[PDB]
Amino acid sequence: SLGAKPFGEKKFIEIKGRRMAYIDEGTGDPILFQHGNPTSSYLWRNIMPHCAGLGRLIACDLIGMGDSDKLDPSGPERYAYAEHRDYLDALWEALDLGDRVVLVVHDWGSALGFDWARRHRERVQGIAYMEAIAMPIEWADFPEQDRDLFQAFRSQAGEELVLQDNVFVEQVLPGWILRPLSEAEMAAYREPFLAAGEARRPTLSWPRQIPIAGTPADVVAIARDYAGWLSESPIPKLFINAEPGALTTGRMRDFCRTWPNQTEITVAGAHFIQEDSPDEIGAAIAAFVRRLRPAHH
Ligand SMILES: [Cl-]
Ligand SMILES: [Cl-]
Ligand SMILES: [Mg+2]
Ligand SMILES: [Mg+2]
Ligand SMILES: [Mg+2]
């Protein structure tokens, strides 16, 4: 259903000196749901129940996000892609996932998940993805009505907009959900970012990492690599397309449509489509996992 309640209570694991928080419910091979910016495990709360009984249902909070600890010192050089990957790779190893992982990914969760999959291909049973960063893009490929704001995040305006005014949480997030959120839902997204200043740095460092027009060159190379791999990989894929969508539209959507061994649905939503159409999304993920894990009841 819709609903504001979280899916379970979080656990944590010590990673590199820091607590990393995660949901972990049920038994079996993992179904691993990975949020991006400026969200947390809470993004999946209404989708995960659809997979009840089908696996170990796991949703990790990225470093500095949700209930995972903040990094200190923090500043403009903190919370880049490579650092998030170093923490997340460590958490995923610590979780003892084995070799039949189904990835379920969104936004920066997709860039991280796709790269992890390229580097651990035998361990990935299926990939379900939506509103993903599936390849490097140009500014012409970015949603038109948000283009100037994202240029501003990437400029020196970003610190005031994000660290002081919290605009990614307060404006971008609800602006990319079709329905109005309740105060409880907003509170859950606000929670890790209540404090002004560096507590909010992950929500600013992230737009500064998006591979657009060849910069930053390091993440562009990473995304070029996973794009090239996915476009030829025989791993079963579930593309959860959205209308109107936001990022996975135009050129990127056409590219995703070339990927092999893939099935597709389309749901209503912009970017944070989990908030508009969670039951349809969950139902599709459940059908996908049932195909991948035939139980013959
Ligand atoms: Cl971002
Ligand atoms: Cl660069
Ligand atoms: Mg501690
Ligand atoms: Mg906290
Ligand atoms: Mg477009």
UniProtKB/Swiss-Prot annotation:
Per the record's keyword annotation, is Isomerase included, yes or no?
no
Transmembrane found in the keyword field: no
Pfam families xrefs:
Abhydrolase_1 (PF00561)
Q: What is its EC number?
A: 3.8.1.5
Q: Please summarize the record's notes on activators and inhibitors of this protein.
A: Competitively inhibited by the key pollutants 1,2-dichloroethane (1,2-DCE) and 1,2-dichloropropane (1,2-DCP).
What upregulates it? Constitutively expressed.
Q: Which InterPro entries match?
A: AB_hydrolase_1, AB_hydrolase_fold, Epox_hydrolase-like, Haloalkane_dehalogenase_2
Q: What is the effect of changing D107A?
A: Loss of activity
GO cellular-component terms in the record?
Answer: periplasmic space
- Mutating N37 to D/E/F/Q: effect? Loss of activity
Effect caused by changing E243Q? 38% of wild-type activity
Characterize the pH dependence: Optimum pH is 8.2.
Query: What pathway or pathways are given for this protein in its record?
Result: Xenobiotic degradation; gamma-hexachlorocyclohexane degradation
Please describe, based on the UniProt annotation, the reported consequence of changing H271A: Loss of activity
Give one GO term, molecular function aspect: haloalkane dehalogenase activity
SUPFAM superfamilies in alphabetical order: alpha/beta-Hydrolases
Q: What is the effect of changing F168L?
A: 31% of wild-type activity
Q: Name one GO biological process term.
A: response to toxic substance
The remark listed among the other comments is:
Is not N-terminally processed during export, so it may be secreted into the periplasmic space via a hitherto unknown mechanism.
Q: Could you give the subunit structure recorded for this chain? A: Monomer.
Q: Which family does it belong to?
A: Belongs to the haloalkane dehalogenase family. Type 2 subfamily.
Q: What is this protein called?
A: Haloalkane dehalogenase
Instruction: Name the source organism.
Output: Sphingobium indicum (strain DSM 16413 / CCM 7287 / MTCC 6362 / UT26 / NBRC 101211 / UT26S) (Sphingobium japonicum)
